Amino acid sequence: RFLKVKNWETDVVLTDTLHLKSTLETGCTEHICMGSIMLPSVRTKDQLFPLAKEFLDQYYSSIKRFGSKAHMDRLEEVNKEIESTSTYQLKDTELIYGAKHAWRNASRCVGRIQWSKLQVFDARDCTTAHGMFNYICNHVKYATNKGNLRSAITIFPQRTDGKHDFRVWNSQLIRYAGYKQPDGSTLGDPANVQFTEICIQQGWKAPRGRFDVLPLLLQANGNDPELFQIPPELVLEVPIRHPKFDWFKDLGLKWYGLPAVSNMLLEIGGLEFSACPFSGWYMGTEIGVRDYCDNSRYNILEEVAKKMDLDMRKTSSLWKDQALVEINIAVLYSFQSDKVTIVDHHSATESFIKHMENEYRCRGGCPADWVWIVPPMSGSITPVFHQEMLNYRLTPSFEYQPDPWNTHVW
Amino acid sequence: RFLKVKNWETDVVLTDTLHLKSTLETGCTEHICMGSIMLPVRTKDQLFPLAKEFLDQYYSSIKRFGSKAHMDRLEEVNKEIESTSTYQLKDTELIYGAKHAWRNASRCVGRIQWSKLQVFDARDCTTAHGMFNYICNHVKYATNKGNLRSAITIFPQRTDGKHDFRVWNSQLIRYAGYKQPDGSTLGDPANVQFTEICIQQGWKAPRGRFDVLPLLLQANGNDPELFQIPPELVLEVPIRHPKFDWFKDLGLKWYGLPAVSNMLLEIGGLEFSACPFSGWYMGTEIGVRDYCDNSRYNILEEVAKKMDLDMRKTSSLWKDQALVEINIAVLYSFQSDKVTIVDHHSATESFIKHMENEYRCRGGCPADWVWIVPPMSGSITPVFHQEMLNYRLTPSFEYQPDPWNTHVWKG
Ligand code: HEM
Ligand code: HEM
Ligand SMILES: Cc1cc(N)nc(CCc2cc(F)cc(CC[C@H]3CCCN3)c2)c1
Ligand SMILES: Cc1cc(N)nc(CCc2cc(F)cc(CC[C@H]3CCCN3)c2)c1
Ligand SMILES: C[C@H](O)[C@H](O)[C@H]1CNc2nc(N)[nH]c(=O)c2N1
Ligand SMILES: C[C@H](O)[C@H](O)[C@H]1CNc2nc(N)[nH]c(=O)c2N1
Ligand SMILES: [Zn+2]
């Protein structure tokens, strides 16, 4: 019940007690592990006050005021507001703590060593999609910081009755369009084909190129969503070239510098923030392995191997593997040259081992999802591969939520 | 109740009902997942239900459930258990069991081949010398001059746990590892502890970098005994690279036959504690893990040096570059010497076809994503995008403690 995790490369063993504070469910039972399922599955007055109590108790513990007058006063004050209003509002300081700890608790995130440096933008006074646009532009500019990227989150008003939801319909703030063609192939980003539809199909005018930055589709107070173009001077992009292959630039590849997830739900103290775009900086493999080389994405392996004149006849020449490394060398090379923050998978996983060490030492544990923490290339030459991890669900947390166009009473 | 898995690269969705036949625990609970944990004495009381469960499965597979053959065999096993406290499997049952143990092995990517297992019944063996003879014949049959054939040899089952047969080697064929006084390691670092036992038991170590370890064999709970596998039975492959001529000068070689020998085979409640089994290698087991793991031969540095790579910052991906070349060399050397090997792209594609077939004709296929996904180039293989359900079916292969920790020495 006071569990242990072993690293098999170093024999270091850690003792996890934090899992005893777990609350939500994992989807596993003692008969079947769902550790590899991508995503398994209104608040009443009754369920809401225990959730607030749990949160405020850990908040006042972290500031070393558990069982103080200020604690009990805040407890009763929120208690009163719930009995009256059927919800409540977080103090700024509780909002920042809640956001930083949703990141800290995100078991699938390898970049958490930076969790405590998050920049939190309170947008709870926003009322309109134009206002949402303004807040999001300010976020993008601050986080991008001319290439010296800084982590940030912007938090729009919390859900009330589910009829007045604030939603960013983009899955990320910055993403490239994707169009089906007569040919039957797909131009641009295939993962964005449906959304690139629902933009044009909502009023957008597509340049129909390969790397067209999608417009924002912003929904305030449950109204119809509105299109907005992010000023190009705010969207930092990196042309992609190889440090050794001059034909690489002729591939005509580029990627954007800012990864900004915008479709998740932030839960703090029982309250639900359905619009909470957050951003950090890329790990190189997200672009080079996944975005470029997934079959259901840009899928450039064949063209790159062709240009390398590799023996593509049999899989045992490891030509996909060989191209894959070169592509990822280039992505890192391009970002570093243009002075835009990026981390390689060796540094990020080494950082995460250090972070686990600190969490076990000063917190008693660190929830972690091996299936997602281990990079999608060169898995076993990174230290996380040999690291046992326990996965459990803490709160505050980021959660998945249904796509809006399926839900909006249009 | 039914359960769905989705392939996120092809949107193929499958429905698992087989998990309803699940017995043993996983280690997971509703509030914690132990999915990445490497490792999560039996009386007549619980034995006949385990036997009955197994025989019901056996007779369903041969389309004879409820037959008089089925009912008499149940009765016969029943009386043998109450009279003798254990029971014996028929030959047919033992073959069925070992095949299905492999079929149920949720961490094995190679399971498309499960129906083609050669089973050697060694239940009449009684001494370590008899064990040595059976294992030699397995190695000769399985190697087949490089045209490898899957096989398993099954020594007598446990009785009171004080008369166990055990193969003390973790694998039938492995290289020695020697710790030097200066702290460095010669050979395979993973085998230092076992090599020391062998030397303590009287093995004369040649102390090279690729010395095949002796077999240490324990019969009927007696002290184990040393034997040297005849070298002409140990097929080995010099590692060269198809473009780099300097690669041969690294002096690398590997044996051809992967043969796991320290696991426990469970069939109908009977425990077979010595059950060596062998197949053929996936390239990455040698090229990624054996050679490049930091706690193994760890040749990335030497290979990166000779490739003249930017080794100053990790972001040059010099490690990933050297790893790919080492894995091309392993595949090229094996193919050139006509020793059966499979690359990780071929092996994962086959397992996806196997898994889909299993869902259709069996109702599911238990699978451990953490172990199925290869240790390099994960997401460019199709298993990476495949959701999988992990649960334990029997017959099964289980882990057991190392014998030198539990053995009572005679002298
Ligand atoms: C600062 C550098 C960061 C790096 C290098 C990083 C890296 C990653 C990576 C590689 C993933 C895997 C997901 C995928 O492959 O698509 C991930 C997931 C995730 N990240 Fe981080 N991230 C960073 C910042 C942040 C920040 C600032 C937040 C929130 C404030 C965050 C929250 C999350 C969450 C919630 C998930 C997983 C969502 C899920 O459950 O599926 N990350 N991250
Ligand atoms: C014939 C070709 C085969 C291939 C290519 C293959 C490949 C693999 C691989 C790569 C693993 C992962 C283990 C690791 O990386 O250390 C594995 C695990 C396993 N294999 Fe197969 N295997 C084959 C045949 C067999 C046979 C013949 C058996 C038994 C009759 C078997 C039973 C198992 C079991 C029980 C495991 C689980 C290991 C554990 O839990 O530690 N495999 N296999
Ligand atoms: C802030 C940040 C930094 C970084 N370095 N990277 C990302 C993107 C990784 C990510 C995080 C999430 F919270 C959710 C997703 C999408 C989840 C599913 C949908 C499609 C495939 N993955 C992705 C975000
Ligand atoms: C038949 C076979 C075929 C193949 N192609 N390969 C193997 C070796 C894979 C394997 C299987 C096992 F049943 C157990 C192990 C070792 C277990 C743990 C101990 C430390 C790290 N691995 C390895 C076996
Ligand atoms: C801690 C972790 O479970 C451990 O490193 C596992 C991960 N996956 C693996 N997968 C395979 N095929 N072989 C292994 O030895 C391991 N080791
Ligand atoms: C089915 C499987 O869960 C799916 O492919 C997962 C595996 N691991 C992953 N790991 C990361 N970091 N990102 C992903 O999108 C996925 N996808
Ligand atoms: Zn689990």
Short mmCIF file of C-alpha atoms in Angstrom, two decimals, chain A:
data_model
loop_
_atom_site.label_atom_id
_atom_site.label_comp_id
_atom_site.label_asym_id
_atom_site.label_seq_id
_atom_site.Cartn_x
_atom_site.Cartn_y
_atom_site.Cartn_z
CA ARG A 1 0.00 0.00 0.00
CA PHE A 2 3.15 2.15 0.30
CA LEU A 3 4.32 1.16 -3.17
CA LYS A 4 7.76 1.03 -4.76
CA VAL A 5 9.02 1.80 -8.26
CA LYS A 6 12.34 0.50 -9.57
CA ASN A 7 14.62 1.91 -12.25
CA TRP A 8 16.18 -1.10 -13.97
CA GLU A 9 19.10 0.82 -15.56
CA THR A 10 20.27 2.18 -12.15
CA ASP A 11 18.57 -0.03 -9.47
CA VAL A 12 17.33 3.16 -7.78
CA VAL A 13 14.07 2.44 -5.95
CA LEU A 14 11.55 5.08 -4.88
CA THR A 15 8.64 4.72 -2.45
CA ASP A 16 5.30 6.19 -3.57
CA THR A 17 2.79 7.31 -0.95
CA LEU A 18 1.11 10.11 -2.91
CA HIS A 19 -1.13 7.64 -4.74
CA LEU A 20 -3.16 7.19 -1.53
CA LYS A 21 -4.50 10.70 -2.20
CA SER A 22 -5.77 9.60 -5.63
CA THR A 23 -9.45 10.25 -6.16
CA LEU A 24 -10.64 9.75 -9.75
CA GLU A 25 -10.62 6.33 -11.44
CA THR A 26 -8.07 4.89 -13.90
CA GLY A 27 -10.24 2.61 -16.05
CA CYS A 28 -8.31 -0.48 -14.94
CA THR A 29 -9.55 -3.27 -12.69
CA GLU A 30 -7.72 -6.18 -11.11
CA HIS A 31 -8.86 -8.26 -14.10
CA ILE A 32 -7.88 -6.01 -17.02
CA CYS A 33 -5.36 -3.23 -17.58
CA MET A 34 -6.43 -0.38 -19.88
CA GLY A 35 -3.06 1.38 -19.66
CA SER A 36 -2.93 1.72 -23.47
CA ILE A 37 -6.46 3.04 -24.12
CA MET A 38 -6.19 6.54 -25.59
CA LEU A 39 -9.14 8.11 -23.74
CA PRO A 40 -11.51 6.14 -21.51
CA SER A 41 -14.49 7.97 -19.97
CA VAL A 42 -23.78 19.05 -14.48
CA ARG A 43 -22.47 19.57 -10.94
CA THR A 44 -25.05 19.55 -8.14
CA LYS A 45 -24.85 21.56 -4.92
CA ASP A 46 -24.16 18.33 -3.02
CA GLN A 47 -21.11 17.07 -4.92
CA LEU A 48 -19.58 20.54 -5.13
CA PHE A 49 -18.75 21.37 -1.53
CA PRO A 50 -16.66 18.23 -0.82
CA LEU A 51 -14.67 19.00 -3.95
CA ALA A 52 -13.99 22.57 -2.78
CA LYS A 53 -13.04 21.34 0.70
CA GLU A 54 -10.47 18.90 -0.72
CA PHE A 55 -8.93 21.66 -2.81
CA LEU A 56 -8.86 24.36 -0.12
CA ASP A 57 -7.41 21.92 2.41
CA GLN A 58 -4.43 21.13 0.16
CA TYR A 59 -4.07 24.81 -0.74
CA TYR A 60 -3.82 25.91 2.89
CA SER A 61 -1.45 23.03 3.62
CA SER A 62 0.89 24.14 0.84
CA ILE A 63 1.12 27.63 2.38
CA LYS A 64 1.51 26.10 5.88
CA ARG A 65 -1.80 27.38 7.22
CA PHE A 66 -3.77 24.15 7.55
CA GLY A 67 -6.17 24.58 10.44
CA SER A 68 -5.72 28.36 10.76
CA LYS A 69 -8.32 31.08 11.12
CA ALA A 70 -7.77 32.14 7.50
CA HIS A 71 -8.32 28.50 6.47
CA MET A 72 -11.54 27.94 8.44
CA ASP A 73 -12.85 31.37 7.39
CA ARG A 74 -12.25 30.60 3.71
CA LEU A 75 -13.80 27.16 4.21
CA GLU A 76 -17.01 28.60 5.67
CA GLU A 77 -17.03 31.52 3.20
CA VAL A 78 -16.96 29.18 0.19
CA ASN A 79 -19.41 26.91 2.03
CA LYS A 80 -21.80 29.87 2.33
CA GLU A 81 -21.43 30.98 -1.29
CA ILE A 82 -22.19 27.45 -2.53
CA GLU A 83 -25.29 27.07 -0.35
CA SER A 84 -26.39 30.42 -1.79
CA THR A 85 -25.16 30.71 -5.39
CA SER A 86 -24.81 26.96 -6.23
CA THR A 87 -21.21 27.65 -7.34
CA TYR A 88 -18.30 29.82 -6.18
CA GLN A 89 -15.35 31.89 -7.38
CA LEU A 90 -11.68 31.20 -6.75
CA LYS A 91 -9.39 33.83 -5.33
CA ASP A 92 -6.56 34.76 -7.69
CA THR A 93 -4.02 32.95 -5.50
CA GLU A 94 -6.19 29.80 -5.53
CA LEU A 95 -6.50 30.11 -9.30
CA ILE A 96 -2.72 30.20 -9.84
CA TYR A 97 -2.18 27.30 -7.43
CA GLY A 98 -4.94 25.33 -9.13
CA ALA A 99 -3.50 25.82 -12.62
CA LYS A 100 0.11 25.06 -11.68
CA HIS A 101 -1.04 21.87 -9.95
CA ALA A 102 -3.17 20.68 -12.86
CA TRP A 103 0.08 20.69 -14.86
CA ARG A 104 2.05 19.12 -12.00
CA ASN A 105 -0.51 16.29 -11.88
CA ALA A 106 -0.64 15.60 -15.66
CA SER A 107 0.76 12.07 -15.67
CA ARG A 108 1.21 12.04 -19.45
CA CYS A 109 3.41 15.17 -19.61
CA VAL A 110 7.17 14.78 -19.79
CA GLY A 111 7.82 18.52 -19.43
CA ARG A 112 6.62 18.86 -15.85
CA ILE A 113 9.96 19.76 -14.24
CA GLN A 114 8.99 23.35 -15.18
CA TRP A 115 5.55 23.09 -13.58
CA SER A 116 6.03 25.79 -10.94
CA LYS A 117 7.06 28.55 -13.40
CA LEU A 118 3.70 28.78 -15.19
CA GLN A 119 2.39 32.24 -16.14
CA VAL A 120 -1.35 32.38 -15.41
CA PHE A 121 -3.56 34.90 -17.25
CA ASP A 122 -6.94 35.43 -15.57
CA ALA A 123 -9.48 36.00 -18.35
CA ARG A 124 -12.54 35.36 -16.19
CA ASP A 125 -13.84 38.89 -16.96
CA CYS A 126 -14.19 38.05 -20.67
CA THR A 127 -17.66 38.19 -22.25
CA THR A 128 -17.30 37.99 -26.07
CA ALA A 129 -15.41 36.12 -28.77
CA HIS A 130 -13.69 39.37 -29.80
CA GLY A 131 -12.54 39.65 -26.20
CA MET A 132 -11.44 36.01 -26.29
CA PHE A 133 -9.47 36.81 -29.45
CA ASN A 134 -7.75 39.72 -27.67
CA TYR A 135 -6.79 37.54 -24.69
CA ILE A 136 -5.49 34.81 -26.96
CA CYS A 137 -3.37 37.19 -29.04
CA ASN A 138 -1.84 38.52 -25.82
CA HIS A 139 -1.12 34.94 -24.71
CA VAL A 140 0.56 34.05 -28.00
CA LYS A 141 2.75 37.16 -27.97
CA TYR A 142 3.82 36.71 -24.33
CA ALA A 143 4.54 32.97 -24.65
CA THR A 144 6.38 33.33 -27.97
CA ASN A 145 8.65 36.11 -26.64
CA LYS A 146 10.58 36.44 -29.93
CA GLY A 147 11.61 32.76 -29.66
CA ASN A 148 12.63 32.59 -25.97
CA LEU A 149 9.45 30.74 -25.10
CA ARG A 150 7.67 30.98 -21.77
CA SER A 151 4.94 28.71 -20.44
CA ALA A 152 1.51 30.24 -20.05
CA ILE A 153 -2.16 29.47 -19.50
CA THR A 154 -5.16 31.75 -20.09
CA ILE A 155 -8.32 30.82 -18.19
CA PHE A 156 -11.74 31.91 -19.45
CA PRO A 157 -14.95 31.98 -17.37
CA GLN A 158 -15.97 28.70 -15.75
CA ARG A 159 -18.96 26.66 -16.89
CA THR A 160 -22.25 27.53 -15.20
CA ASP A 161 -25.19 25.49 -16.56
CA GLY A 162 -23.50 23.93 -19.60
CA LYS A 163 -25.57 26.21 -21.85
CA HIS A 164 -23.11 29.13 -21.54
CA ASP A 165 -19.83 27.32 -22.17
CA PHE A 166 -16.73 29.19 -23.31
CA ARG A 167 -14.93 27.05 -25.90
CA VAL A 168 -11.94 27.34 -28.22
CA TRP A 169 -12.90 25.07 -31.12
CA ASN A 170 -9.32 24.70 -32.35
CA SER A 171 -7.49 21.74 -30.83
CA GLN A 172 -4.36 23.92 -30.72
CA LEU A 173 -4.11 27.69 -31.11
CA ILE A 174 -1.74 27.27 -34.08
CA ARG A 175 -2.23 24.42 -36.57
CA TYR A 176 -1.97 23.92 -40.32
CA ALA A 177 -5.00 23.39 -42.54
CA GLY A 178 -5.85 20.16 -44.35
CA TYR A 179 -7.87 19.70 -47.55
CA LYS A 180 -9.03 16.61 -49.38
CA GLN A 181 -8.42 16.78 -53.10
CA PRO A 182 -9.96 15.24 -56.28
CA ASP A 183 -6.87 13.00 -56.50
CA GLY A 184 -8.14 11.36 -53.31
CA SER A 185 -4.99 12.26 -51.37
CA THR A 186 -4.86 14.94 -48.68
CA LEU A 187 -3.21 18.36 -48.94
CA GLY A 188 -1.78 19.88 -45.77
CA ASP A 189 -2.48 18.27 -42.41
CA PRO A 190 -4.85 15.25 -42.53
CA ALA A 191 -5.56 15.44 -38.78
CA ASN A 192 -7.14 18.85 -39.40
CA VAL A 193 -9.25 17.88 -42.43
CA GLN A 194 -12.58 17.99 -40.60
CA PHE A 195 -11.76 21.20 -38.73
CA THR A 196 -10.44 22.83 -41.90
CA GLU A 197 -13.84 21.88 -43.32
CA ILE A 198 -15.85 23.36 -40.42
CA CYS A 199 -13.89 26.60 -40.95
CA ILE A 200 -14.64 27.06 -44.65
CA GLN A 201 -18.02 25.42 -43.96
CA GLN A 202 -18.38 28.24 -41.39
CA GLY A 203 -17.05 31.10 -43.52
CA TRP A 204 -13.27 30.82 -43.87
CA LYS A 205 -11.50 31.49 -47.17
CA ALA A 206 -8.71 28.96 -47.50
CA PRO A 207 -5.47 29.77 -49.38
CA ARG A 208 -5.48 26.00 -50.13
CA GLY A 209 -1.75 25.68 -49.57
CA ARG A 210 0.01 23.01 -47.57
CA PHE A 211 0.96 25.11 -44.52
CA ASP A 212 -1.97 27.50 -44.04
CA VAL A 213 -2.34 28.64 -40.42
CA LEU A 214 -5.93 27.93 -39.40
CA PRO A 215 -8.13 30.76 -38.06
CA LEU A 216 -9.36 30.83 -34.49
CA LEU A 217 -12.96 29.69 -33.92
CA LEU A 218 -14.03 31.21 -30.63
CA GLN A 219 -17.24 30.51 -28.68
CA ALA A 220 -18.22 32.85 -25.84
CA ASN A 221 -21.18 32.24 -23.50
CA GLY A 222 -22.42 29.34 -25.60
CA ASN A 223 -23.05 31.51 -28.65
CA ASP A 224 -22.21 30.65 -32.24
CA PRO A 225 -18.41 30.62 -32.71
CA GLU A 226 -16.60 33.31 -34.70
CA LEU A 227 -13.59 33.22 -37.02
CA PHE A 228 -10.50 35.30 -36.25
CA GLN A 229 -7.13 35.46 -37.98
CA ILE A 230 -4.09 35.46 -35.67
CA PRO A 231 -1.79 38.26 -36.93
CA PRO A 232 0.99 36.60 -38.93
CA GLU A 233 3.62 38.59 -37.06
CA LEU A 234 2.45 36.77 -33.92
CA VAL A 235 2.91 33.26 -35.43
CA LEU A 236 6.60 32.36 -35.21
CA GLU A 237 7.53 29.63 -37.71
CA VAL A 238 10.78 27.80 -38.46
CA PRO A 239 11.84 26.80 -41.99
CA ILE A 240 13.28 23.29 -41.76
CA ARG A 241 16.69 22.47 -43.21
CA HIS A 242 19.37 19.84 -42.52
CA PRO A 243 22.86 20.74 -41.26
CA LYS A 244 24.34 18.44 -43.95
CA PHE A 245 21.76 17.85 -46.72
CA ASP A 246 21.24 20.97 -48.82
CA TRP A 247 18.41 19.29 -50.73
CA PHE A 248 16.49 19.20 -47.42
CA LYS A 249 15.43 22.85 -47.68
CA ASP A 250 13.98 22.12 -51.13
CA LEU A 251 11.45 19.82 -49.43
CA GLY A 252 9.69 23.05 -48.46
CA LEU A 253 9.04 22.11 -44.84
CA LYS A 254 8.39 24.43 -41.90
CA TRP A 255 6.73 24.17 -38.49
CA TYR A 256 5.41 26.64 -35.93
CA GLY A 257 7.30 27.37 -32.74
CA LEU A 258 4.50 27.49 -30.15
CA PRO A 259 2.65 24.33 -29.00
CA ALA A 260 -0.62 25.62 -27.45
CA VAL A 261 -3.26 23.05 -26.47
CA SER A 262 -6.68 24.67 -26.48
CA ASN A 263 -9.41 21.99 -26.29
CA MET A 264 -8.94 20.55 -22.79
CA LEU A 265 -10.96 21.11 -19.62
CA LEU A 266 -9.29 22.42 -16.45
CA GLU A 267 -10.89 21.18 -13.21
CA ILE A 268 -10.07 22.98 -9.92
CA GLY A 269 -11.95 22.54 -6.65
CA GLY A 270 -14.92 21.06 -8.48
CA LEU A 271 -15.17 24.00 -10.91
CA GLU A 272 -14.90 23.38 -14.66
CA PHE A 273 -12.98 25.73 -16.98
CA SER A 274 -13.86 24.57 -20.50
CA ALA A 275 -11.65 27.18 -22.22
CA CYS A 276 -8.12 27.24 -20.90
CA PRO A 277 -5.50 27.30 -23.70
CA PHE A 278 -2.01 26.47 -22.42
CA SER A 279 1.36 26.50 -24.13
CA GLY A 280 4.99 25.61 -23.51
CA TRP A 281 7.70 24.63 -26.04
CA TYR A 282 8.19 21.58 -28.27
CA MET A 283 10.05 18.38 -27.75
CA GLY A 284 11.69 17.74 -31.11
CA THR A 285 10.06 14.32 -31.68
CA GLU A 286 6.51 15.74 -31.55
CA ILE A 287 7.21 17.49 -34.87
CA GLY A 288 9.72 15.17 -36.53
CA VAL A 289 8.46 11.73 -35.52
CA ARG A 290 4.71 12.32 -35.20
CA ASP A 291 3.71 15.39 -37.26
CA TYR A 292 6.01 14.61 -40.20
CA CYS A 293 6.23 10.78 -40.30
CA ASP A 294 2.94 9.36 -39.00
CA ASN A 295 1.04 7.70 -41.85
CA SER A 296 -2.15 9.54 -40.82
CA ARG A 297 -0.29 12.89 -40.97
CA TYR A 298 2.29 14.50 -43.32
CA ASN A 299 3.90 11.06 -43.95
CA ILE A 300 7.04 12.31 -45.68
CA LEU A 301 9.26 9.29 -44.97
CA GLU A 302 9.10 7.89 -48.50
CA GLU A 303 10.04 11.21 -50.13
CA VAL A 304 12.92 11.77 -47.70
CA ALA A 305 14.29 8.24 -48.11
CA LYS A 306 14.02 8.62 -51.90
CA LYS A 307 16.15 11.78 -51.68
CA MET A 308 18.68 9.87 -49.54
CA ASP A 309 18.76 7.07 -52.17
CA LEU A 310 18.24 4.40 -49.53
CA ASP A 311 17.31 0.82 -50.40
CA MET A 312 13.54 1.10 -49.92
CA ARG A 313 12.84 -2.40 -51.29
CA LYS A 314 12.86 -4.41 -48.04
CA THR A 315 12.00 -3.21 -44.56
CA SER A 316 15.15 -4.87 -43.12
CA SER A 317 17.39 -2.12 -44.57
CA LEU A 318 15.93 0.07 -41.79
CA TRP A 319 15.48 2.93 -44.29
CA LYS A 320 12.46 4.33 -42.42
CA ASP A 321 14.53 4.35 -39.24
CA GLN A 322 17.45 6.04 -40.99
CA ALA A 323 15.36 8.79 -42.54
CA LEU A 324 13.50 9.21 -39.27
CA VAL A 325 16.72 10.16 -37.44
CA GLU A 326 17.81 12.63 -40.13
CA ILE A 327 14.40 14.37 -40.12
CA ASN A 328 14.61 14.76 -36.36
CA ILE A 329 18.19 16.06 -36.52
CA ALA A 330 16.96 18.75 -38.93
CA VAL A 331 14.00 19.87 -36.78
CA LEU A 332 16.31 20.40 -33.81
CA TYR A 333 18.93 22.02 -36.06
CA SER A 334 16.43 24.47 -37.56
CA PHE A 335 14.88 25.55 -34.26
CA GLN A 336 18.25 26.01 -32.56
CA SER A 337 19.59 28.03 -35.50
CA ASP A 338 16.58 30.36 -35.49
CA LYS A 339 16.98 30.62 -31.67
CA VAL A 340 13.52 29.22 -30.86
CA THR A 341 13.25 27.09 -27.72
CA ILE A 342 13.16 23.33 -28.34
CA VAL A 343 14.30 20.30 -26.36
CA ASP A 344 15.53 16.95 -27.63
CA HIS A 345 14.07 13.73 -26.27
CA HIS A 346 17.30 12.82 -24.49
CA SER A 347 17.33 16.07 -22.48
CA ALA A 348 13.58 16.09 -21.75
CA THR A 349 13.56 12.51 -20.46
CA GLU A 350 16.69 13.07 -18.39
CA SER A 351 15.01 16.17 -16.95
CA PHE A 352 11.93 14.13 -16.15
CA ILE A 353 13.92 11.51 -14.21
CA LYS A 354 15.34 14.39 -12.15
CA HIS A 355 11.80 15.73 -11.67
CA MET A 356 10.53 12.33 -10.50
CA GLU A 357 13.43 12.22 -8.02
CA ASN A 358 12.34 15.60 -6.63
CA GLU A 359 8.65 14.71 -6.50
CA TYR A 360 9.30 11.46 -4.61
CA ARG A 361 11.70 13.32 -2.31
CA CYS A 362 9.57 16.40 -1.50
CA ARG A 363 6.03 15.16 -2.28
CA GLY A 364 6.00 11.36 -1.96
CA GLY A 365 5.34 10.50 -5.59
CA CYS A 366 4.73 11.56 -9.16
CA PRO A 367 1.90 10.10 -11.28
CA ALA A 368 3.27 9.04 -14.65
CA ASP A 369 1.97 7.29 -17.77
CA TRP A 370 4.82 5.24 -19.28
CA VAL A 371 2.94 4.71 -22.59
CA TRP A 372 3.05 8.50 -23.14
CA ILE A 373 6.26 9.48 -21.32
CA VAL A 374 8.53 7.22 -23.43
CA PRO A 375 9.43 9.10 -26.69
CA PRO A 376 8.20 7.71 -30.03
CA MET A 377 11.76 6.99 -31.22
CA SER A 378 14.90 5.51 -29.64
CA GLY A 379 12.79 4.51 -26.64
CA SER A 380 15.24 2.30 -24.76
CA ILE A 381 18.25 4.63 -25.05
CA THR A 382 16.30 7.22 -23.01
CA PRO A 383 16.30 6.76 -19.23
CA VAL A 384 12.50 6.78 -18.86
CA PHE A 385 12.25 3.46 -20.74
CA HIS A 386 13.84 1.60 -17.83
CA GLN A 387 11.84 3.51 -15.22
CA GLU A 388 8.83 1.92 -13.56
CA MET A 389 6.02 4.49 -13.21
CA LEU A 390 2.77 4.43 -11.25
CA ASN A 391 -0.21 6.06 -12.96
CA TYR A 392 -3.04 7.53 -10.92
CA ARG A 393 -5.38 10.46 -11.16
CA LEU A 394 -4.95 13.52 -8.95
CA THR A 395 -6.83 16.80 -8.82
CA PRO A 396 -6.65 19.65 -9.95
CA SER A 397 -6.38 18.16 -13.45
CA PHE A 398 -6.66 18.68 -17.19
CA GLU A 399 -9.32 16.41 -18.71
CA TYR A 400 -10.54 15.69 -22.21
CA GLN A 401 -13.94 17.02 -23.26
CA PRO A 402 -16.21 16.35 -26.26
CA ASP A 403 -15.55 18.24 -29.47
CA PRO A 404 -17.82 21.32 -29.57
CA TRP A 405 -19.43 20.87 -32.99
CA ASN A 406 -20.95 17.60 -31.75
CA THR A 407 -22.50 19.41 -28.76
CA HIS A 408 -23.43 22.98 -29.72
CA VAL A 409 -27.13 23.70 -29.96
CA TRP A 410 -26.25 25.60 -33.13
#
